[PDB]
Amino acid sequence: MTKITVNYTVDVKDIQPKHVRSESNPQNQNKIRRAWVLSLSDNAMEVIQNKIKSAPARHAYYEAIDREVSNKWIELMRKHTTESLNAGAKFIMTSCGERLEDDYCGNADERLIVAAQIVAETIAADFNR
Amino acid sequence: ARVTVQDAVEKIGNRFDLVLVAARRARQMQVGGKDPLVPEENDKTTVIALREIEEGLINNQILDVRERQEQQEQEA
Amino acid sequence: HARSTGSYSLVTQQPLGGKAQFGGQRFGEMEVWALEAYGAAYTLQEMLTVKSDDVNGRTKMYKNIVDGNHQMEPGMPESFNVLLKEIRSLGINIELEDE
Amino acid sequence: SPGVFFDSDKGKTHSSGKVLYNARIIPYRGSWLDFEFDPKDNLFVRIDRR
Amino acid sequence: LRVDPTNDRLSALVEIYRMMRPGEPPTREAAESLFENLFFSEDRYDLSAVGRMKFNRSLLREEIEGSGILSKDDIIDVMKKLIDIRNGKGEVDDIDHLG
Amino acid sequence: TEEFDAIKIALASPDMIRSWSFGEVKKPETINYRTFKPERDGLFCARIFGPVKDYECLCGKYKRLKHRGVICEKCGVEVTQTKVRRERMGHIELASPTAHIWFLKSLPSRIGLLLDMPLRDIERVLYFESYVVIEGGMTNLERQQILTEEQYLDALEEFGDEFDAKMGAEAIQALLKSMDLEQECEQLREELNETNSETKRKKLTKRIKLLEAFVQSGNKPEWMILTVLPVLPPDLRPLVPLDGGRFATSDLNDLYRRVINRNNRLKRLLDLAAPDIIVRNEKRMLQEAVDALLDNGRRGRAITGSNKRPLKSLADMIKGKQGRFRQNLLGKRVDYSGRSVITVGPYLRLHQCGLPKKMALELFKPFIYGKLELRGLATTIKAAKKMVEREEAVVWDILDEVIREHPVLLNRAPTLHRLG
Amino acid sequence: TADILVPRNTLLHEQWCDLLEENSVDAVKVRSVVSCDTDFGVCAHCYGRDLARGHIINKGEAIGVIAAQSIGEPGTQLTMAAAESSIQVKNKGSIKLSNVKSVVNSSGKLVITSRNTELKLIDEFGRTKESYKVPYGAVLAKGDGEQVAGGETVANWDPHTMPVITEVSGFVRFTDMIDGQTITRQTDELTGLSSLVVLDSAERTAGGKDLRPALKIVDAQGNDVLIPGTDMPAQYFLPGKAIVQLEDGVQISSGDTLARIPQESGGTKDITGGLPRVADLFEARRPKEPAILAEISGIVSFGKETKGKRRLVITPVDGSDPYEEMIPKWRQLNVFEGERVERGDVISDGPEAPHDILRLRGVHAVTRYIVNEVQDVYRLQGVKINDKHIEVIVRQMLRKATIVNAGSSDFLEGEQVEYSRVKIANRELEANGKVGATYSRDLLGITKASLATESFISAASFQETTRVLTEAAVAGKRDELRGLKENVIVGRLIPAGTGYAYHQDRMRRRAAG
Amino acid sequence: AAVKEFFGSSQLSQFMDQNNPLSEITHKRRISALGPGGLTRERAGFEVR
RNA sequence: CGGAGAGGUA
DNA sequence: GGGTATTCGCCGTGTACCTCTCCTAGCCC
DNA sequence: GGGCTAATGACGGCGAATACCC
């Protein structure tokens, strides 16, 4: 709809612990959706409401966007592993499985928010037609 | 007849394959195909087979060689 | 009391019913362990499958003994079939790894 | 018999031993009443077995 | 009292009604009615003559009779003598005693 | 017998459950009550579970014993061997999904652990008492969290078509539909590559173990919610009326009649587009009926008339004390067995026991029949029956022959060792 | 002498037992089912030969059911010198001591410390005839290789209290001494002693639990004096009810008590016998404050004291130093800061739990403990049962182990130790070892082990059925029909006895064989 | 209905063991700690037995 | 031969 | 924080036989 | 007539879910 879509992406202030959940156990989900919401503004809400007139279709495209951000986040972890290995990282075998070295390790929250911001920019570009 | 299986246990130490071979012997004396090698007293095939095994007349070697040979003569 | 052939349940082929011919005596799991302690291995199979549950086994073995020999059919006891069916009745699958 | 029964709750050691007490009120008809003790010497009340 | 999470009649009645009946959003009047019926109505809680006699005998009263329903004085007496039995002044009652 | 080396255990998909059933159960009827004719297509149905008699249709159509390889083409009865009625299973298509009672109240709540959310919330949402955000949108509140009525409303006015929340097993089915196992496994294993905290990595590993367990089991969690409920074969829950005013029969038939009545009422309500409150209450009491059928004891006792005792559910006679009942205890009785008081025989050799003549006669009856027919003393099994019941002196020599070498096992009822 | 008198791995029948009898031997190592390495079964020689025959155990004999019924049959008979006073040898023989933490000090006192010291009575041969346990602190006028008459007090101690005999000379400094918190003020001087009482080891004070009173023994110059030969540290960290006999400022000789810790003179009522006792050994039930063991060797010290339960850091000399552990504050302890502990050394005092014995002291140690306790229960009623049955039951209880470093596990999966061994054998056979793979055995009760069976059928059909069936359905398990009971339910030849020959053949017939 | 249920199908309304006058007189003088409001058979119970 | 309750037995 | 330390449900209950009852009924159509 | 149709005086053990001093 709107030729310009305001974004809340690539902000330095967008780094904060995404561990919000109202029930037990803080692992994945209840944060991924919040992550890729925090990268989008309300203008996205109005644009999707005008473009799509079906609530089940809207929910399906929300799930599609969530799968896209998950795929891009997985791409981010594999890229981080590849660049760490190119930087001389070693596979640390702890009693939790595989990890990288401390000086080579990243963190999931920053990768997740970067993925969310980039996908939000992609969606904003998608609204520009 | 015979009531004690001590001699058969001495012949066949495992005494589990002893049950198998005794059953085999007793079944094909009960079901047509052969006749006992120890004379009868109107006894069932069980004690007859036991008395055979005590005398060392029937064991796994004798049984399977007899089966082999009867297969060659029956086949041609 | 004793019996050889007579009444059977309409839910299973275990022998029970009335007192005109009461069912066979209840050879419980304790006596199954008693047989297991021996090398009593076939005896369990006859006393659980052909003499107790397998209706096809019961008929075949009765015909065999009447015919003048003591031979057995292995059989598939109906008790396990009942357990299988009612496990399947709750939406929990049971299947057979066919040989 | 309906009435007041002061019995002893045993086996509640919790690495501290000590036999606790319980007072049960039994009516001929109705709901029982229970005044039991705890290892912290705090009196807890149960109506029936609630 | 320190552990007690309520300090007034209405909250105590509400909590008692709740733990009697899970769910069932409670009102003060309903809780009052239930509490009065379970312990102070002579159609839901009766000790009968023998119950009252044994009740008085256990608490060491000279009376041999009284109301069939529970009363505040009876409950405070049960408190006092249970505290006494904790203090060692009282004695636990036998459970299979024919008395 | 059938040849197999192993038994697999897995959850059942609605598709393969429908594959099990040869027909859909519709009528909540066993018989015509006062009239003892079974009602089709009720819980007993020759069209569904096959004929009650052997090699003959029961409609009044076929009486010839020739149709055993084909079904009746004159009516709906699937005429086969009577044994087929003991093996054919049925199904009922639930209008609303219903949770499986075991996966809810069991201490290792499989739905609870799979959804990482306590069984208290599971029962509150299933009992139609609390909302849960089922895959929301850009809402400031959590994507997956419990809600009661007031906040659910406040969100409903606050958030429009970006907010989904529902009642009963439909909501839990929505959550289980929305979860992809492989994506979550990849996400967790990628997180382990970066995370270096003990607690985070430990919970990642626990979630990975559960997820790979579900993946290797090949079970879609959507299969774990009941869309179609299979009904057990009629013969294994047989119909046995008791004469008089009472209409007593198998408890399973009663529970299934209850459930099918509830399903029919709910389907009728939905077909008429009944108000949400009525259909929700019908769904709740359908959940109650199904959970009572599957396992009585986790939803409140379901009691029958004139007997203060819960009806025995499927799980209650799956479970046994001691051990699964009909496998070896209780009770696994056996033919060719007997019981008697014991007397002392001090003239017996150690390998001998004294057995009553009548007991020997009516224990070894097939042996007597075979020997009599082999020796020419009888010409048929009926002649053998007459000979053994007359108990003449002739059969005594036959019994001597069959007992001379044939041994018997003596057994004490409390058996504490093999010598027992 | 090193003269071999028994053949390699041969059955020990009556003649061999005799030959061991005239050529007396104290102990014999025998292949046990616990030590058996055979997978999916037990080695014949590892079992024994006890049947209705003197011959070696036959192949295919279902010994597990025999063991279970041999334990169950005498169950119907189960119904429900001086110990801890003074060791008085009632025979004539050499005095021998094992696992001593003792130093000879003045007045000819062989002051033996710790509860880990044992006193044998060696007869004319290597065999022992009397056995005793020497407690922490004792007075011995006898030594190794000394003959003693019957009824002679070879070792003695106060039967009403345990005295702590000082082993070095010098003044005693009261370290970790806070007045009014650690101990209460009580001075009763008769000949220079005091009645200062360390508060009970349940709850002392706010400050008397965050600190623990100690008595360091140092010379007049004040330099630290060490005790070479014992692991008992020079600083006596006073436990509960330890009355400090010796005051500060007085030189102490070697042979004088330092602290008195009262004892109950034996006969403590914390024991249960009979059929429930046998059952709870077979279920490995917690003994209601088990005497927890020192789970690693090395020097020990207290950690952050009294955080609800006091943490005790054991720092090995070459191992992982950060090894704090938990201690409840309702037990009386034997080990103090700076005392050398090892695997199986007791931390608290009381009954042992089978789990910690198995995990720490070893599988053979827990097997010995269970066999000894069960056989003692059967001796109480004068019914003798061959210990191989208890051994196979123990072998069945411990079929599971927790993986630490996995080969194909998940670093915390409780897996069948049989499967763990088959995978480690497979990986070691190949030229590549991955990872790996380390496992620690853990004990399960009869019920829990039965539910922890590889096959869901056995656990479901004869114990908790709903839970087992649900877990099997969700996990998608499959069972190769394994043990006998599965075949009993299925109704075919069980792989035992005369049936074992059949099913084994079928196992050969599989895999296109 | 309630009275008939009590007198016919209660757990303390037992068929009188009638083979001897002693059997009668013991059955009527029996004292059952079981029943509604009392013990249960599976008590054990070592104190009450 | 659908299932509960009671007694007695070992 | 953390380890008890409770509180909240699930669960187990020798064997086998004999005898005996006693068996979904409410109800608005 | 009828077609649907709707507690404890257990005890010991144990896993799950919070509860409570230091």
Swiss-Prot record, chain A:
Residue runs in coiled coils: none
Swiss-Prot/TrEMBL keywords: DNA replication
Source taxon at top rank: Viruses
Alphabetical GO biological process terms: DNA replication
Summary of the function given for this chain in its UniProt record: Binds to host RNA polymerase core.
Protein name: 15 kDa RNA polymerase-binding protein
Protein's organism: Enterobacteria phage T4
From Swiss-Prot, chain B:
Entry's EC annotation: 2.7.7.6
One GO cellular component term noted in the UniProt record for this chain: cytosol
Superkingdom of source: Bacteria
Signal peptide segment: none
GO MF entry, a single one: DNA binding
GO BP terms in the entry: bacterial-type flagellum assembly; bacterial-type flagellum-dependent cell motility; cell motility; cellular response to cell envelope stress; DNA-templated transcription initiation; intracellular iron ion homeostasis; nitrate assimilation; protein-containing complex assembly
Catalytic activity: RNA(n) + a ribonucleoside 5'-triphosphate = RNA(n+1) + diphosphate
Quaternary context: The RNAP catalytic core consists of 2 alpha, 1 beta, 1 beta' and 1 omega subunit. When a sigma factor is associated with the core the holoenzyme is formed, which can initiate transcription. The rRNA transcription and antitermination complex (rrnTAC) consists of RNAP, NusA, NusB, NusE (rpsJ), NusG, SubB, ribosomal protein S4, DNA and precursor rRNA; S4 is more flexible than other subunits.
Similarity comment text for this entry: Belongs to the RNA polymerase subunit omega family.
Function: Promotes RNA polymerase (RNAP) assembly. Latches the N- and C-terminal regions of the beta' subunit thereby facilitating its interaction with the beta and alpha subunits.
Protein name: DNA-directed RNA polymerase subunit omega
Native source species: Escherichia coli (strain K12)
Recorded name of the encoding gene: rpoZ
Curated annotation (Swiss-Prot), chain E:
Superkingdom of the source species: Bacteria
PTM info: Acetylated on several lysine residues in the presence of glucose.
SS bond partners: none
Usage in biotechnology: Co-administration of salinamide and rifampicin or salinamide and myxopyronin suppresses the emergence of resistance to both antibiotics.
Membrane-crossing segments per the record: none
Function statement: DNA-dependent RNA polymerase (RNAP) catalyzes the transcription of DNA into RNA using the four ribonucleoside triphosphates as substrates. Resistance to the antibiotics salinamide A, salinamide B, rifampicin, streptolydigin, CBR703, myxopyronin, and lipiarmycin can result from mutations in this protein.
Family the entry assigns: Belongs to the RNA polymerase beta chain family.
Subunit relationships: The RNAP catalytic core consists of 2 alpha, 1 beta, 1 beta' and 1 omega subunit. When a sigma factor is associated with the core the holoenzyme is formed, which can initiate transcription. The rRNA transcription and antitermination complex (rrnTAC) consists of RNAP, NusA, NusB, NusE (rpsJ), NusG, SubB, ribosomal protein S4, DNA and precursor rRNA; S4 is more flexible than other subunits. In pull-down experiments interacts with CedA.
Protein's recorded name: DNA-directed RNA polymerase subunit beta
Species per Swiss-Prot/TrEMBL record: Escherichia coli (strain K12)
Gene field: rpoB
First and last residues shown, out of full length: 351 to 449 of 1342
Swiss-Prot record, chain F:
Biotechnology: Co-administration of salinamide and rifampicin or salinamide and myxopyronin suppresses the emergence of resistance to both antibiotics.
Disulfide bonds: none
Entry PTM: Acetylated on several lysine residues in the presence of glucose.
Binding locations of Zn(2+) 1: C57, C59, C72, C75
Domain of life the protein comes from: Bacteria
Subunit (UniProt): The RNAP catalytic core consists of 2 alpha, 1 beta, 1 beta' and 1 omega subunit. When a sigma factor is associated with the core the holoenzyme is formed, which can initiate transcription. The rRNA transcription and antitermination complex (rrnTAC) consists of RNAP, NusA, NusB, NusE (rpsJ), NusG, SubB, ribosomal protein S4, DNA and precursor rRNA; S4 is more flexible than other subunits.
Family assignment from sequence similarity: Belongs to the RNA polymerase beta' chain family.
Function: DNA-dependent RNA polymerase (RNAP) catalyzes the transcription of DNA into RNA using the four ribonucleoside triphosphates as substrates.
Protein name stated in the entry: DNA-directed RNA polymerase subunit beta'
